[PDB]
Amino acid sequence: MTTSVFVSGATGYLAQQIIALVLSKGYKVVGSVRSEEKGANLKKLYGDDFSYEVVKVLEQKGAFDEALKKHPEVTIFLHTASPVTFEVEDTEKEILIPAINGTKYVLQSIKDVAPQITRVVYTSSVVAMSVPEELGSPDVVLSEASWSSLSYEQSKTHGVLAYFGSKQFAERAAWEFVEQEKPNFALSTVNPVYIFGPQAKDEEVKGTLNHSAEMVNSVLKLNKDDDVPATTGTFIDVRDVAKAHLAAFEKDEAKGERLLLSNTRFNGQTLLDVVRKNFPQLADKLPVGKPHSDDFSAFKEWNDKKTKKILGFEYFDFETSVVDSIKQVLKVQ
């Protein structure tokens, strides 16, 4: 018989790509959603091998118990749902607690009611490994060993810092659970940088603007006199992140590992240069800046050697990820 994979936050951008990939390899999927209609929409998109359960609040003890009890066929759990909204009334209630408590409660639910689950993957982030000023530093070398120094108290102050904290603390909690609770499953994490690339379904393009994907896609909203975007950092293609999740549960080597998913540096000029060459009909409708003035040669390469060895595949290049993302938006209008 077939294996079932559980995916929390099935509505999301990364989660959908993960689902499409997992389905392609012959797994069944069970997705968590915050509403019935949200589930129903996904079901129409993904078909018969996809099912959903409604889990409205992560941060309640036993939130996943019923859903797990309903799906004894599931032997893999991918916990991807997390807050990603930076502008909030209460950083704790809206960012920190759902990530941290929600993560702690999922793991406990799996141990309580899903002993059959062999593998759990937590979707972390580079923000778990760092602080904001570090990410942009040519002198900083991140690795799978890196942990953020941000305090919980500091993390509270505003939404961005809260997200950084939410990831670091939830991930630490996940590792702590494994140590303390001695579950049946092995844990692994995936720690991505900014995620670019096309959405899993064309139908989902119009609906919400994922904060990372929109960093690429927003270029289409520029006009000829606008400034070059100041957006900058490191990227990873969504399809690569999804493949990493697959590796994260499939490979023996992945057990107990953190995977740093990071490719190349970019800025707004890099982005503009790609789009203008690829979509030359847009050239007259976009700024030019200073083509190929971007220089990243000073930046020390991050140490992802272990992750790359474990994964064993090559990443999508920046132009490809960008072009694929734009082609989709154009197709849909």
Ligand X SMILES: NC(=O)c1ccc[n+]([C@@H]2O[C@H](COP(=O)([O-])OP(=O)(O)OC[C@H]3O[C@@H](n4cnc5c(N)ncnc54)[C@H](OP(=O)(O)O)[C@@H]3O)[C@@H](O)[C@H]2O)c1
Nearest to ligand X of 53, 289 (CB atom): 53
Q: Which residues pair with 233 in a beta bridge?
A: 266
User: Please, which of residues 191-250 interact with ligand X by CB under 6 A?
Assistant: 192, 194-195, 210, 212
Nearest to ligand X of 11, 75 (CB atom): 11
Cα angle value 257/258/262 (rounded, 5°): 140
Q: How far apart are CA 322 and CA 256, in angstroms?
A: 32
In this chain, which stretch among 77-85, 138-146, 219-227, 272-280 interacts with ligand X, using CB under 6 A? 77-85
Nearest to ligand X of 32, 276 (CB atom): 32
Q: Which residues pair with 190 in a beta bridge?
A: 123, 259
Closest C-alpha among 18, 39, 184, 191 to residue 109: 184
Helix, strand or coil for residue 250?
helix
In this chain, which stretch among 12-20, 108-116, 225-233, 274-282 interacts with ligand X, using CB under 6 A? 12-20
Joined tokens for residue 102? 């929600």
Q: Which ranges in the chain belong to alpha helices (H)? A: 13-24, 36-46, 65-70, 91, 97-113, 132-135, 152-155, 159-181, 211-217, 238-250, 268-278, 305-311, 318-332
In this chain, which stretch among 41-49, 74-82, 154-162, 277-285 interacts with ligand X, using CB under 6 A? 74-82
For residue 80, state whether it binds ligand X (rule: CB under 6 A): yes
Q: Which residues pair with 195 in a beta bridge?
A: 236
What would the x/- binding string for ligand X be over residues 287 to 326, using CB under 6 A? ----------------------------------------
Rg for the chain, CA atoms, rounded: 20
Nearest to ligand X of 27, 64 (CB atom): 64
User: Please, which of residues 111-170 interact with ligand X by CB under 6 A?
Assistant: 123, 125, 167
Instruction: Tell which one of 21, 54, 84, 220 touches ligand X (CB under 6 A).
Output: 84
For residue 83, state whether it binds ligand X (rule: CB under 6 A): yes
Instruction: Tell which one of 5, 12, 108, 188 touches ligand X (CB under 6 A).
Output: 12
Q: How far apart are CA 37 and CA 43, in angstroms?
A: 10
Q: Which stretches of the chain bind ligand X, using CB under 6 A?
A: 9, 11-14, 33-34, 38, 58, 80-84, 98, 123, 125, 167, 192, 194-195, 210, 212
